[PDB]
Homo-oligomer: 591 residues x 3
């Protein structure tokens, strides 16, 4: 009596579950045949216009220190770095200990090395030219006698092939199908709480995979009041991600003209060393307009003193250790950079223009968690400049307690992983099922978004939304990205690239759960009607979920998304009752 | 009308041989966070919940099961899965090095040092090492030139084994992609090819424990209540017959000495592991076995020898020389290989009238193996610190009939060695892959309980039971199929390994196209469920002319397509055109 | 007669030109399976013998020769097939060392050599007995008796795995379901023209995936006279080709007995060179009768006249360079040939404006070949012991223009070589690929026994083409398992080494592009609501602004291929505006259903 069971195929309630993302690009504005080691010649053309609807009443917590998109792309970029390294040739025989003298200049930085090597198998020997500097050469047995690479005693070094470019491209991570992506718009979300002003979106936004440490550049601005985030403070063994509103923009350059000379080793082997030099050489200085840097720190200390009992807070430079960890390591214009940040944190303040960062460049790049493999870049000819907006910092607080009640800050840096978190804090993946379970007691203006929040009604419009979200679940051209008819004719690409793993992965996923819904409904009730009541039977013998309809007319689908996790037996027993009700009727017309 | 009103039928135990590829199935019992230190398996990534299967006991039927398709798939899979491990593993780059080998205190021919005089790959320095070595690993000249070198150097390259990985088996379960079935013969008293009397079916296999075994069958499965040997060609002396055992035979083996481990640096990412040093006692590894049980057991087996095949005399000569592997008994346990001179087992001779202490065997260890069908593949193992004690159940013996003259001695059964192919044949001896076409056609005379159910009777309603079979296919949540809940999540992050999931996605993508491939005919015929889909076609008796009785109760439906469903294919087209010329007349004229 | 509802159609046999991944077919694997080594170079699925090819001699649209699709896509295929077989083979790396060579005497083509070789660990051989041809060495100096490998600047070091042979297998390309291959039963129109008699074909006829220079082997024939294929600025300067009307054939010789000596190199590697020669050597030579050459070559003049009025002709020899297209290039016997055509084109024809009836060819062979489109990696070819006799048919040649004015009333046709692309671009000329858009839109009709195949109603009778739609479904885009799953489950699963060849990854790509289409078309049929039927009518008045045509022109004699280009402009309109009008009655339908 009263049936108490309906599937309600039109219900927008989610499951907090990871999946595999879907990759995308926007190379339709560029189409450069140089392949841009991230972009790898144009993933898929982006959408012309994405859509969002604010979902005002949902207030879900998002621990951004538990987001799987952090770790999932963490393997992806390394693998993208791993793949595009692989075909290009490696410096295996070039590991010989070498003599090396400095250049005529400063302070004896640049060093011209000479060395024997049997490059070819044609038995070659010659004192070959090689130009370096003191950041890649370790000395052996004395400061002045012997010289060798700081790596290749242990690691593996490889010359990346010069054709591809180190220019980060604004991409879109995007979800394949069915399951979607959430967005936190209200400000001051420190990363451990709930958030408000929440909308959803299919592809994220223009994400830029930048890699430099000790600062954050070309990231977002969040043009409001300043906010700073960290997983923890009292656990002082954590780190602080700083975010900044005011777009500080810093220009940097290489102060000299350079050429490209190659060492022709053997088959397919043309080692590109530092060719030559014309002019004088500087330390590639960076000027900041310090009055902004004098300014914006005073913004920070106000929004930090409050979090630690209006108490003394100061800045000290970081300690010793590793060049990737304490030095401002930097990459723009393709070529890498190190910069001494001591002129920025010599600043201890407690409440009442031009600059020179003597910078360095770095060629061979080790891993960040291993000792195994190391990547090498060729020198780029001529001069180069780079100017970019800088937004947000990376800071830690030292754990030792002093006898003043003050806090020493030393700048964080040394991880790939949390660098991407700053672009991901607004976002959360969620898994979508249109499935539902809700008893019926009743008779037996457009929202594009995937939520309507008024779960007190099933039926005023809460049925009508996923009707429109079913229109997502089938799409060909410009609705669904993958089933776009033009690119499928275009895509005769091999799958051995990380693309062809990730590309069809989404497509085989998209089809199967589309059929997975389709089978599981079709054996149990066809979707010709959205509400499945052929007097499908009542459940109050073991459901017993004590409620009446008018309090279901004032509720959310909150308990409704946690009835049949305790009682999924109810879901299964309607299947056999579907099986039991059909096994008597059809064979009755048979015999 | 008694005119043949054709009608489709969805749900019928239609069989055919097929050659498909399968998924794995196991438990998180011995998981312990090793899908990488385990073996090739990756701990068998998907999950077997529960062997909820139902067998069938209706009919006897010919199957000739010794000619199957699982066996050669397993030959490709495991060797590939062996390749999967060693591909990130390093390569021994100095191979045919000088190796000044000697050892102090002359048991002789024991473990020796060999003193590398090598150059590293990075620098240009020449250095000296110590390295412990068995006798079975080197090849000298003249016994005093110290010309010992690694045996498989001139064959091919030799790798190390990425020493963090173990070597135990795990009982796995081959599960077919659904829409299929797996058949098995368990009516007792049965051997090899020919018919059986049991139509018992399963969805997944039992716990195959795939150890690559030598001469004896090692903790696989025991036989039935009676010792039986499987059916082969008893002529031709080249079928290498194998007999199972009713009882189990138990043997434990152990190296008495304990050993340490060193690490020798070679080059970039090349720290090579060898035996460090030995503590005190240097006794050889032996293997003891109660001969009184062994004296008993062979008495049983020669009874089944003479009576089933030539009852006169039998001489167990040992196998003669040749292969270093086929002669001795190369046992694996503890993640460790060792060979065994089993000559102290077959010095027996048997007759009928004149018939009716725990022997120990000296075994010995080799550090190098080789591919058996190929010269191109060779492997190491890391020396395991300390001591290893592990036992084993013996489950069967591999036999070879020889001889050209017999009046002196009628039977020469030398202990047969393996091919590596037959070890699966020892365990896949009763299985067969069967595709199902659930659709089928037969006349109607009206126009317009287990997993297979009755292979003999009529279908009152048992087709409907075949539908829940046919629609579990991509449930996604329902736990019998593969449950697709942890089964999705275990692979969706790590499909990038591409050794086992490439089966699984191909298992996926085959399952869906057999779904739609069965749907497309249903979609075109407009049946779309309803399980019977009556039409109105008067069909000629050009094919079958029998009365309404015997077509309908006296005969079955597996035989039905064999007996007169012949050069048809056009019967499909006849019901195809009928519906279109119906609906066009129904819609744009009526 | 003015209800004028639109009607959905599924299976109107239309097509558009597209690009698609390919899919093999070779049922000769079931015929002969000698070894799995040519099959390692050429692994393929077996299909149904006796397919159904249906002739539709009404539609005669233009066939884009010289811009055709498949010439591109298979070209990059075969390089990867050659790359796939080469990668696990060894790389003869340290043999770039200089080679002290002496002359074997009993010309001076073949030469014995000796050099230093460092092995695996430690052994040094003084005089390795290495035997070499003339045309694989370079003098470091002219008076120097030391010689070096020619292309050893780059990766010459690859040598083939010697258990593998190199013999062509009749292969057939297939597109997956939803697609079709076309073929021109019109008798030898031109290069680039619309031809009348055409047909459908699922998978093409036998192809020998071979390579040749100024020559074509085992191709097709002309049922008519000799025909040619060309284009516009070919008449300015670009290579044209030759298709002879009937096959002439040569039988081309071997030297003698050969011996396959192995040379130890290192750990997992062993180089193979010619050990020993039994007897004295005759050069390899081909036999061909000049009378067969004489009779056909005047027909070439008849064709050069059927083009350039009746002007006379001179065949000077090809060029003064390019050692790869100055001679011939065969692969039979697992061996690469070169034959000087100097003795062949001592020809010039009559001004119409006999000794030794058979002719021999002084020929040579090289052990080392090299790719051309990129300077780089190169293959060594192993010696073949025994006898290397060979014979094949000649069916075609390739020719240049030689633009210019010298005598002002003559022309030179020095024979054309070419790239690798032309050899297929020759014999793929009848063939082109289309897709199917089986969804159809045409307005309603006012009124409320012979076999055809794939496109059997698409030729003509377009109102009557509305009958029999499902033959355009059942096997054509339905029946995914037709040759994609039917007979391949064993043998192309039986030992595919490393499980991912170039064919299977296409085949993986093949099966999904079927169902992505098939679900995706069903997706729209999901959205369109009229699903579970074949045709259906919605409730929207077709405005005459789309087509003010009289209804008899539609349902009797106007082609669906030009019907669609008339509706083409308003396609994105109807697709949107009718499903929302469907959604307009649907949002009232739940208002009728729920409320
Ligand atoms: C964070 O984001 C910021 C913001 O995007 C990045 O900073 C940008 O970095 C990009 C590249 O990294 C800069 O674009 C490059 O600028 C080069 C310098 O151009 C200036 O000088 C030239 C000559 O004096 C002027 O003509 C330029 O004026 C033009 O560009 C400006 C800026 O858009 C326009 O406003 C003007 O109207 C002009 O259109 C600039 O004043 C520039 O050389 C370079 O262009 C070459 O490279 C591109 C591909 O990169 C080629 O397609 C193109 O053909 C050029 O190639 C020629 O020159 C090179 C030079 O070596 C030769 O090698 C070639 O052979 C060929 O001759 C490109 O436009 C951009 O200016 C800069 N902007 C700012 C505000 O910083 C940061 O890099 C980024 N960092 C991180 C960590 O994310
Ligand atoms: C255009 O198309 C046509 C057809 O469409 C092509 O014609 C083909 O041309 C090739 C090349 O000539 C032929 O294949 C090769 O033939 C070689 C000659 O074989 C004959 O001589 C040898 C030596 O005396 C005999 O042994 C042969 O007889 C044996 O084989 C035939 C046929 O199988 C049987 O009937 C006999 O009973 C014998 O069994 C012939 O008389 C031949 O040497 C060569 O063969 C080997 O390679 C395969 C693996 O690839 C081995 O399995 C096989 O056993 C042979 O291997 C031996 O020889 C090699 C040589 O080095 C050694 O390395 C091995 O270790 C082993 O000792 C191959 O068969 C082909 O027959 C012919 N087909 C037709 C229909 O004419 C044109 O080539 C083609 N042209 C172009 C440009 O594409
Ligand atoms: C141009 O298209 C037309 C169709 O529009 C096409 O016509 C077909 O031509 C062939 C060849 O003349 C005909 O086929 C013959 O049919 C008879 C039976 O009626 C068979 O006996 C013949 O078989 C013999 O000859 C075959 C070789 O042609 C042998 O293979 C065979 O073993 C037998 O010896 C043969 O099949 C066919 O009937 C006509 N079709 C019609 C409609 O008339 C013509 O082929 C097309 N031309 C091009 C170049 O494709
Ligand atoms: C190929 O296409 C042609 C035309 O595209 C088809 O021929 C046409 O067939 C129709 C139907 O048979 C003919 O209409 C009838 O013609 C007869 C003869 O005059 C007449 O008596 C009838 O009253 C009716 O009008 C039509 O005339 C004819 N036209 C032409 C140009 O042939 C042909 O059937 C198609 N065949 C194949 C194999 O594709
Ligand atoms: C310039 O370099 C040369 C050669 O190394 C050296 O002898 C000389 O002292 C240098 N001079 C200056 C001004 O640095």
């Amino acid at each position: 009596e009263k049936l108490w069971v309906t599937v309600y195929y039109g219900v927008p309630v989610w499951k907090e579950a990871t999946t595999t993302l879907f990759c995308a690009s926007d190379a339709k504005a560029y189409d450069t045949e140089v392949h841009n080691v991230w972009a790898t010649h144009a993933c898929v053309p982006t959408d012309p216009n994405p859509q969002e609807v604010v979902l005002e009443n949902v207030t879900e917590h998002f621990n951004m220190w538990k987001n799987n998109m952090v770790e999932q792309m963490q393997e992806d970029i390394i693998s993208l770095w791993d793949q595009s390294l692989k075909p290009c040739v490696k410096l295996t025989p070039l590991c010989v200990t070498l003599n090396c003298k400095d250049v005529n200049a400063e302070r004896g930085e640049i060093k011209n090395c000479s060395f024997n090597i049997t490059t070819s198998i044609r038995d070659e020997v010659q004192k070959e030219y090689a130009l370096f500097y003191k950041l890649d050469v370790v000395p052996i047995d004395n400061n002045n006698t012997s010289y060798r690479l700081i790596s290749c005693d242990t690691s593996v070094i490889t010359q990346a092939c010069p054709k591809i470019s180190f220019e980060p491209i604004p991409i879109h991570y995007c979800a394949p199908a069915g399951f979607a992506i959430l967005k936190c718009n209200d400000k001051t979300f420190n990363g451990k709480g709930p958030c408000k002003n929440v909308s959803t979106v299919q592809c994220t936004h223009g994400i830029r995979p930048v890699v430099s440490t000790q600062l954050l550049l070309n990231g977002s601005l969040a043009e409001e009041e300043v906010v700073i985030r960290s997983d923890n403070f009292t656990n002082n063994a954590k780190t602080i991600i700083v975010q900044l509103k005011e777009s500080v923009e810093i220009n940097c350059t290489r102060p000299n003209n350079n050429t490209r000379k190659s060492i022709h080793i053997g088959p397919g082997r043309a080692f590109y060393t530092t060719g030559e030099i014309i002019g004088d050489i500087r330390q590639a200085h960076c000027n900041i307009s310090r009055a902004k840097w004098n300014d914006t720190l005073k913004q920070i200390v106000i929004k930090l003193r409050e979090q630690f009992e209006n108490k003394t807070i100061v800045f000290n430079h970081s300690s010793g250790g590793d060049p990737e960890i304490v030095m401002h390591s930097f990459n723009c214009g393709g070529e890498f950079f190190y910069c001494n940040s001591t002129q920025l944190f010599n600043s201890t303040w407690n409440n009442n223009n031009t600059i020179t960062l003597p910078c360095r460049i770095k060629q061979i790049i080790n891993m960040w968690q291993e000792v195994g493999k190391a990547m090498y870049a060729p020198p780029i000819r001529g001069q180069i400049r780079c100017s970019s907006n800088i937004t947000g910092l990376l800071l830690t607080r030292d754990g030792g307690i002093n006898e003043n009640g003050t806090e020493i800050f030393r700048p964080g840096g040394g991880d790939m992983r949390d660098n991407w978190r700053s672009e991901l804090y607004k976002y959360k993946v969620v898994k979508i099922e249109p499935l539902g379970v809700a008893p019926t007691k009743a008779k037996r203006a457009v929202f594009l978004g995937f939520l309507g929040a008024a779960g007190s009604t099933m039926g005023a419009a809460s049925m009508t939304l996923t009707v429109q979200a079913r229109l997502l679940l089938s799409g060909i051209v410009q609705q669904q990205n993958n089933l776009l008819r033009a690119i499928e004719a275009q895509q005769r690409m091999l799958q051995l690239t990380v693309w062809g793993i990730k590309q069809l992965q989404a497509r085989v996923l998209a089809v199967e759960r589309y059929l997975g819904d389709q089978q599981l409904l079709g054996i149990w009730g066809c979707s010709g009607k959205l509400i499945c009541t052929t007097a499908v039977p009542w459940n109050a013998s073991w459901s017993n979920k004590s409620l009446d309809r008018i309090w279901n007319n004032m509720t959310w689908m909150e308990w409704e998304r946690e009835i049949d996790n305790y009682t999924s037996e109810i879901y299964t027993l309607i299947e056999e009752s579907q099986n039991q009700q059909e096994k008597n009727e059809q064979e009755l017309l048979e015999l």
